[PDB]
């Protein structure tokens, strides 16, 4: 356990923390959960979660001793989650028993195979012209409008008979829009089989930071339990 | 006591060790002779900007408390004597015995203290009366290319109001030293000085007190005012100043910014220029408007001190160069000038008549890219409305002159237009009193039958 | 006379002590390799190393040579291709050259200057014909890559054999297969007996490429200050 | 708690708190000085905390322009941020930054009713959905770019583009007429304005139902930041619990983030890209998605945005375009081409411009519109050097009625009767519509393009050409 | 009562004193020492000090080479800021930056008076201003922008536009027959050109009415600054206290500017935009604020300053408009069309193009040629993309003149014989004010494109008209 001696914009410097792992979660009297970043040789950068205006220096800080988990599991789908295991939209706890590391390791070259398998999303452009697989990584690059959503919500909507567990991510937007999009989504059903993590603008940075990590992490369970996913980032 | 010890000198930045009283804003003496003033209260020391020539102050030097902000001595014991940013003579002529003093740190006048912009103010330029109107109170800039007609406008502006019970502060802000008499004499030699006064901060002198040069100024002008005046100040130039300003930050150990120039700049001039003002009834009903001067590098007006000025003041005359050379003077660009008072502050004949000539002249410089039976009346009515504008150095014009041959262009009344203009004049001088003098009482035009006649009359001759 | 070095940071060192050592001074790491001081704060002294720094660690010793930045010169370089260090290059036994000159040398001015009436015999026809040169003058060759600078510079050097000019061909940032090309026609023309070639390639600290052109010119005013021509080309200043 | 002043550097003050307790962030202070001898100067001040440090010292942003300011002065805590009155007894009034009344009708007690500025964001369980057509009059933001009600409204401009003059539009039609309670909060603007529009607003009738909010320039970064928030909390108390309507006009809040650059460099922080401070994003979402509408009650908000450099690829700009729900853009172009209003068709967007909530009478069209727009920029330019008759006739021809489009998209407005003269006229979206039919009809071919400068209802065209 | 070396960094070295000793701005410090050892060397070395930084030290600036100076070695304080000979003494001899001779003929005593350096510049109860026309009988120059007696006069150039050339030929058509005291300060310039113009003033009789001090390239950071103050503190002098009007060339008093920013980031002060130090603009006009007309005599001096690049938006440069009386600009791109001088019409001005001043004849021909100037500039783009043949009949007779006149704009300098077939060629005022009413009316325009290069009078134009069939 160790002392707060700065504070300000969600960043901290500790002192003490002498056992902190890089990674590490800490926590505080308040219950905001934070991030170690930066180790130096007299004081320890936390990185805050949640809204900070309640610290004061002076705070006792205390390792929890285990890096970040995020829990899965099937039931999830349909929920509205944070990047964290947080809910969102309320009914009740999340349905999860079983909880993944963020830090998992890359497949190496040995365990991979050749794709001949495609995805589809219904357009005719970009179904046949640019044509992607079922193990592809594929990049979209734009200023805003245009159009860059219709092409995610086209992608999850479509794949109805072809299975697919699919996870949209929304990173830094208003609330608005994602309820928008989401009730728009609820109108054909895709609620059945896709899971959205939301992390708005008056979140904390920090969420914006770890929403991608949680949007391949929910994802990676049902690959090794030997399943089909699809990952889809806003922005 | 309030004493000190200097252990730090350079490029008239001193610091200094004690002090403990010492408020920002004070003044505080050296043994030399010359002032300082803090800007900086770090923990142990304090940052002091010295206020003229620096070369006797030593390590271990003493440094003495005064105990007041910053001040101005004014009065009507100034008026026609060329002074320094502080209150010492430059023509020297004995001191100017002053004994009230301004501090010019104040608060600025808030709302319900200030009215709206009513009575018209005349330079005797077609070009500017007419096109881009100006009213007294308001905050009209102009920016422009270096050697492009800027110093005339203020001259002229000056030597024509003297009809007027006005007063006017001019300022000559970071120029060689000599070359402000070219100025001071010629307004001596049609009299426009016998009711100003002149503020110079030459090269010579350090440049901390470019920063205060044209901080003076307005508050000469402020003192003057809180009784019924119509008062005008000019710098004729603030460009330099924010260079001044800039590599005074510079060596106080004060990070930089979106360029050299620090991010403080936009402040600055809020503090400036917002000082000006036109109070109500219930507090006077004076007037201070400025004309300030700003220069660019090679008439960018995108860059970060053109539109940083731009978003205070109350308009904009731009200057272009390349007009300038085409013969056509001032090179007023009749498309990008604004101004945002309008026709508040305007005598009432002009509405009648060219009210909306600004948007034709836009119109008629929008369609000459294009042009390079309607549209070629619209040509030759806005070849002509050019024509017209014209105007030379030293040879204004008065307003009650102005609205008559405004109405013949605007009525649809190339080679000889300019001396058509002359002509008129004098026929308007020896015969036309009688609408004269009702252009000089009512401030509405007369009948319009008899300046038909006038006007036919004359195209007859 | 004593001290440790302390920092070995990318090429650039730190030193302790040293009290009596001038700037522009020759240093010697126990390791073997040459350096130069440039700074000299209040209690710490710069220094600059002209060879390969992987060998220093801290708390090495190091060592005042005692002199400014003295090259050798003389008539035994002649045949040789040498480091600007003053070391050779392709072997044959150590220089017994004696006499040295400071490459910081103050340069002569006022009252000890000609005009110029005599031509520099290039004998490319073009540049003669055009664009003449004398000596004592300094032209610049400058341009785009891949167009044939250098063969100007070979052509020059080899046609200096009838004006008994004594020269030197400078070296810097270039490919050994270049360097080794040009060599091998100038042994085979038999102008290496009389010209002094330097090189610093493209393999070698920066330093070394920054010092090259001085020692290339001090190792070539010597043989004017005794009376004779000299003519010296730089590879590339860029 | 007492403290001690012990630094100052102008927008920055540095205090420390030895007493053993420590002010929270966000909390207000005060300071009182009487001088000792007639060269001080007495004073009477507040300032905000934004930092910690660890040996018990605090920073401080200035909201008023200070000098005279001394070591060794004693500073007192509140406990709480800057509080804002709110209910029945602020309609009618002009405050400033800590709440105190601009205006000479008098005194507010202090029994009134204050809310905090800063609180929490709404949730995603409550925010409204569902979005309706709001008419304004003007002829290009009513069809192209409409304004969903209860949403975010922002006008995009460079440096004199005539953004006031059409907000000044907007409040005077508007704000008329709904029974909304109404608030107008100036953040980066003239002082002049800020004057002239509580006489004006003292003269329409408007001052029963609007309350006002200034401090404009003439004061440090400290002001112009929570000037936004104050009109926020305000509208905050009236939404919440009385549950009525809100109109919002924000005006320059681009001024928020400028001013947050300029103590950035004073407060440890580094520079970033042009030179914004690093917390760009984390400050200004704190202030974008509180003013957001509910299913208790719906706020219109209305915003002026000032383009730092005349260009949009500036982190600023960047920053903001991803709050709005329809964004009008004005571009200097169109400003010195003397068609006013300076919005260019092509730029602006809405989410609006569904089959759902225009119907199909006004998708067509204006899809017909903007798309001949967008062709027609790419052909004049060529125009400028193959000529005029080089091109063909049928391309010609899409000069030949774009330019038409284009000059009838100015509007004589009613606010602008001092600039032009003129007292205006008036269309409802219907006549919109129809009137581009019309001129996509063929039906105005013969008619010179000059005509249609200016101009409102398109049966005043007919008009001018009678009158030419 | 002695000083210290403690820290030397190149150009800058930092000096130590004791209590109540420290030296003012300017003063000059001596160092002197004799090898000890066998491993020191000799050097004799002469300090400016610029800034005080506590703890009983201040920074100076090395007016030599710093090389071999050994840490804690004497320092001597002469209290007095760099003197320098001044008077009758110092005509037809040459001297240093520090102001010894360095023409070997002799030396100069001490019983010559020697004067600081620096001086406050004068009041304006002293000041005085005046217009009259200095004339050098160029074409391009003497209509456009005329030159005022006491002013100053600006050029503005590349790296190699003929700076120098122009220079030279203002002297072999002024500086001889103008009948006043001639100084020559060689700031920066090529070694070669300095000794070369020795002997060009020795053998031609017109030394005994000269002075020069120079500071080539060679010179350390030091003493290229002071090179133009040891020069202007010898024409103040001839101005002041014997009444005789003055003449003073400076080529390239740029690398004053250039010379800080080498020192500055060694100095320890934070910089500027593009690196300079944060004291371009007061520095500047401490130094041109001295070079000014006096109710006693008249200082006229004509200066060139070095632009770093084919940019003149650089602030080193851009600041320098606010001293100038006369400007004259170059370009590279309007020498390369076989031009000379290049001298851009429409950027280069002069306060003396007034109407009052010059006549209405003169005034009117200046407005003429700038007027027809700015619509051939303007028409640039379209007729480099399609071709002259597109514009009007009333834009192509317009295209038919612009260029005869830039051609005429030429002139062969008396420096250029050595490169031309023919010598320098004289047209006074009242030839060049003539000149261009011919073509502008009609009269000569007719003539081919290439006749009017290089050319004087208008008569000549016809014969070489003539000459080529
Ligand atoms: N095929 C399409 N045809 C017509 N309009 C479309 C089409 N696809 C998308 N849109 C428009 O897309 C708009 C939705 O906003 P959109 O342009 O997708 O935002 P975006 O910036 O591209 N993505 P985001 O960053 O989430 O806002 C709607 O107003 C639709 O009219
Ligand atoms: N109306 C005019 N008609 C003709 N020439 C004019 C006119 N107004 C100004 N000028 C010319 O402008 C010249 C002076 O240039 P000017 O641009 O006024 O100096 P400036 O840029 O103001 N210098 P500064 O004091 O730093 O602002 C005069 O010599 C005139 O030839
Ligand atoms: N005058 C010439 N006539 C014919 N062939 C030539 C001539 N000069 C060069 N070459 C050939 O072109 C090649 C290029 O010449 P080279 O001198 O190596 O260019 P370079 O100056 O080294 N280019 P770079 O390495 O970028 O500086 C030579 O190796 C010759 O084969
Ligand atoms: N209909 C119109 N006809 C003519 N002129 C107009 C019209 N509308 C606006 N203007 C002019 O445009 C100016 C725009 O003023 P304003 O709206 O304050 O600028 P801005 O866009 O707000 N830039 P800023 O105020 O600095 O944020 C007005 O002052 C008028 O001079
Ligand atoms: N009348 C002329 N005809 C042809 N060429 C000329 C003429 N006058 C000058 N030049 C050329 O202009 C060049 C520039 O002259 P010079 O003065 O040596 O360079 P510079 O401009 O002074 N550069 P620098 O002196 O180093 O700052 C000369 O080398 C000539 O080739
Ligand atoms: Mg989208
Ligand atoms: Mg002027
Ligand atoms: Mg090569
Ligand atoms: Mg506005
Ligand atoms: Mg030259």
Do not use: W
């Amino acid at each position: 356990v160790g002392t707060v001696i700065q504070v300000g914009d969600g960043i901290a410097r500790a002192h003490g923390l002498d056992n902190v792992m890089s990674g590490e979660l800490v926590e505080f009297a308040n219950g905001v959960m934070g991030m170690a970043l930066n180790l130096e040789e007299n004081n320890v950068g936390i990185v805050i979660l949640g809204p900070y205006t309640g610290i004061k220096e002076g705070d006792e800080v205390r390792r929890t001793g285990r890096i970040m988990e995020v829990p899965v599991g099937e039931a999830l789908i349909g929920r509205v989650v944070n990047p964290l295991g947080q809910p969102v939209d309320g009914l009740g706890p999340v349905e999860t028993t079983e909880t993944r590391p963020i830090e998992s390791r890359a497949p190496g070259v040995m365990d991979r195979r050749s794709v001949h398998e495609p995805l589809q999303t219904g357009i005719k452009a970009i179904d046949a012209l640019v044509p992607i697989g079922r193990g592809q990584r594929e990049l979209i690059i734009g200023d805003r409008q245009t159009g860059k959503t219709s092409v995610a919500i086209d992608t999850i909507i479509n794949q109805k008979d072809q299975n697919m567990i699919s996870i949209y991510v929304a990173i830094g937007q208003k609330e608005s829009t994602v309820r928008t999009v989401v009730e728009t989504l609820r109108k054909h059903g895709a609620l059945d089989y896709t899971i959205v993590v939301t992390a708005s603008a008056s979140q904390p940075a920090p969420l914006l930071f770890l929403a991608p990590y949680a949007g391949v992490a929910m994802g990676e369970y049902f690959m090794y339990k030997g399943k089909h996913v699809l990952v889809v980032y806003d922005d | 006591s309030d004493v000190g010890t200097v252990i730090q000198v350079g490029d008239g930045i001193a610091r200094a060790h004690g002090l403990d009283n010492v408020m920002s804003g004070e003044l505080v003496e050296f043994a030399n002779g010359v002032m300082g003033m803090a800007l900086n209260l770090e923990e142990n020391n304090v940052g002091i900007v010295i206020l003229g020539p620096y070369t006797g102050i030593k390590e271990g030097d003493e440094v003495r408390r005064t105990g007041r902000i910053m001040e101005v001595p004014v009065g009507e014991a100034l008026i026609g004597r060329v002074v320094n940013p502080l209150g010492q003579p430059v023509d020297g002529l004995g001191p100017v015995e002053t004994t009230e003093t301004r501090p010019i740190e104040s608060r600025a006048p808030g709302v319900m203290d200030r009215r709206s912009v009513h009575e018209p103010l005349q330079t005797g330029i077609k070009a500017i009366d007419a096109l881009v109107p100006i009213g007294r109170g308001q905050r009209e800039l102009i920016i422009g290319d270096r050697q492009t007609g800027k110093t005339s406008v203020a001259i002229d502006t000056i030597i024509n109001q003297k009809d007027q019970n006005m007063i006017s502060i001019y300022v000559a802000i970071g120029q060689k030293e000599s070359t402000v008499r070219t100025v001071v004499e010629t307004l001596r030699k049609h009299g426009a000085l016998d009711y100003t006064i002149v503020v110079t901060a030459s090269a010579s002198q350090p440049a901390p007190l470019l920063f205060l040069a044209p901080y003076a100024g307005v508050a000469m002008g402020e003192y003057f005012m809180y009784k019924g005046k119509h008062v005008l100040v000019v710098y004729d130039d603030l460009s330099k100043q924010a260079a001044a300003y800039r590599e005074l930050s510079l060596l106080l150990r004060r990070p930089p910014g979106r360029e050299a120039y620090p991010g403080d700049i936009f402040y600055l001039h809020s503090r400036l220029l917002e000082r000006a003002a036109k109070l109500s009834d219930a507090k006077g009903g004076g007037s201070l408007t400025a004309l300030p001067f700003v220069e660019t590098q090679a008439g960018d007006i995108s860059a970060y001190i053109p539109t940083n000025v731009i978003s205070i003041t109350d308009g904009q005359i731009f200057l272009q160069s390349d007009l300038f050379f085409s013969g056509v003077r001032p090179a007023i660009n009749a498309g990008l000038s604004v101004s945002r008072v309008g026709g508040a502050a305007q005598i009432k004949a002009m509405k009648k008549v060219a009210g909306t000539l600004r948007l034709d002249l836009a119109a008629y410089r929008e369609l000459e890219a294009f042009a390079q039976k309607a549209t070629q009346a619209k040509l030759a009515r806005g070849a002509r409305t050019v024509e017209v504008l014209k105007q030379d150095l030293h040879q204004p014009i008065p307003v009650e002159k102005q609205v008559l041959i405004i109405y013949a262009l605007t009525r649809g009344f190339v080679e000889d237009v300019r001396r058509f203009e002359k002509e008129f004049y004098l026929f308007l001088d020896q015969n036309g009193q009688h609408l004269l003098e009702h252009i000089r009482t009512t401030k509405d035009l007369p009948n319009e039958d008899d300046l038909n006649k006038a006007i036919e009359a004359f195209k007859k001759t | 006379d004593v001290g440790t070095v302390i920092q070995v940071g990318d090429g650039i060192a730190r030193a302790h002590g040293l009290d009596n050592v001038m700037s522009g001074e020759l240093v010697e790491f126990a390791n073997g390799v040459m350096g130069m001081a440039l700074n000299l704060e209040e209690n710490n002294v710069g220094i600059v190393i002209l060879g390969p720094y992987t060998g220093i660690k801290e708390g090495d010793e190091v060592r005042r040579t005692g002199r400014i930045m003295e090259v050798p010169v003389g008539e035994a370089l002649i045949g040789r291709v040498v480091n600007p260090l003053g070391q050779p290059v392709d072997g044959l036994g150590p220089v017994e050259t004696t006499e040295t000159r400071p490459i910081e040398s103050r340069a002569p001015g006022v009252m000890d200057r000609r005009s110029v009436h005599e031509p520099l015999q290039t004998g490319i026809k073009a540049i003669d014909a055009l664009v003449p040169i004398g000596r004592g003058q300094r032209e610049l060759i400058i341009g785009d890559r891949q167009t044939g600078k250098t063969s100007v510079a070979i052509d020059t050097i080899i046609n200096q054999k009838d004006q008994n000019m004594i020269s030197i061909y400078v070296a810097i940032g270039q490919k050994e297969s270049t360097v080794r090309t040009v060599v091998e026609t100038l042994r085979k023309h038999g102008a290496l007996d009389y010209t002094i070639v330097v090189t610093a390639s493209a393999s070698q600290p920066a330093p070394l490429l920054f010092l090259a052109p001085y020692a290339g010119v001090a190792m070539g005013e010597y043989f004017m200050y005794k009376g004779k021509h000299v003519l010296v080309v730089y590879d590339d200043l860029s | 708690t007492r403290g001690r002043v012990i630094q100052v550097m102008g927008p920055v003050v540095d205090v420390k708190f030895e007493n053993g307790h420590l002010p929270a962030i966000y909390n207000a202070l005060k300071i009182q000085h009487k001088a000792r001898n007639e060269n001080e100067v007495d004073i009477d001040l507040t300032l905000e905390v934004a930092l910690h440090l660890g040996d018990d010292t605090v920073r401080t942003i200035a909201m008023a322009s200070t000098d005279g300011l001394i070591r060794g002065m004693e500073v007192i805590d509140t406990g709480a941020p800057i509080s804002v009155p709110v209910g029945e007894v602020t309609l009618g009034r002009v405050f400033n930054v800590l709440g105190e009344p601009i205006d000479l009708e008098g005194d507010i007690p202090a029994d009134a009713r204050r809310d905090p500025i800063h609180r929490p964001a709404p949730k995603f369980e409550e925010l409204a959905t569902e979005v309706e057509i709001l008419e304004t009059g003007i002829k290009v933001v009513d069809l192209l770019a409409p304004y969903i009600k209860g949403g975010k409204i922002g006008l995009f401009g460079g440096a004199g583009v005539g953004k006031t003059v059409l907000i000044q539009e907007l409040i005077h039609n508007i704000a008329q007429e709904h029974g909304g309670i109404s608030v107008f909060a100036g953040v980066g603007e003239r002082t002049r304005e800020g004057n002239d529009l509580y006489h004006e607003m003292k003269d329409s009738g408007v001052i029963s139902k609007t309350a006002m909010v200034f401090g404009q320039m003439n004061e440090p970064p400290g002001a112009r930041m929570r000037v936004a928030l104050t009109g926020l909390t305000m509208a905050e108390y009236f939404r919440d619990e009385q549950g009525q309507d809100v109109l919002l006009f924000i005006d320059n809040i681009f001024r928020f983030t400028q001013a947050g650059s300029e103590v950035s460099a004073l407060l440890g922080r580094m520079p970033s890209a042009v030179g914004y401070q690093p917390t760009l994003a984390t400050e200004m979402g704190q202030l974008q998605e509180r003013i957001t509408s509910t299913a208790k009650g719906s706020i219109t908000s209305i915003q002026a945005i000032y383009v730092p450099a005349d260009d949009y690829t500036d982190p600023a700009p960047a920053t903001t375009f991803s709050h709005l729900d329809a964004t009008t853009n004005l571009e200097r172009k169109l400003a010195e081409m003397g068609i006013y209003p300076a919005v260019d068709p092509l730029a602006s967007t809405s989410r609006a411009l569904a089959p759902e909530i225009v119907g199909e009478e006004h998708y067509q069209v204006a899809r017909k519109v903007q798309q001949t727009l967008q062709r027609y920029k790419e052909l004049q330019d060529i125009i400028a050097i193959l000529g005029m008759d080089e091109l063909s006739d049928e391309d010609k021809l899409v000069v030949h009625r774009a330019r038409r489009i284009q000059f009838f998209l100015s509007q004589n407005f009613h606010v602008a009767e001092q600039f032009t003269g003129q007292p205006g006229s008036y269309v409802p979206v219907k006549e919109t519509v129809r009137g581009f039919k019309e001129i996509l009809e063929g039906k105005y071919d013969h008619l010179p393009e000059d005509a249609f400068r200016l101009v409102g209802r398109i049966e005043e065209v007919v008009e001018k050409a009678k009158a030419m």
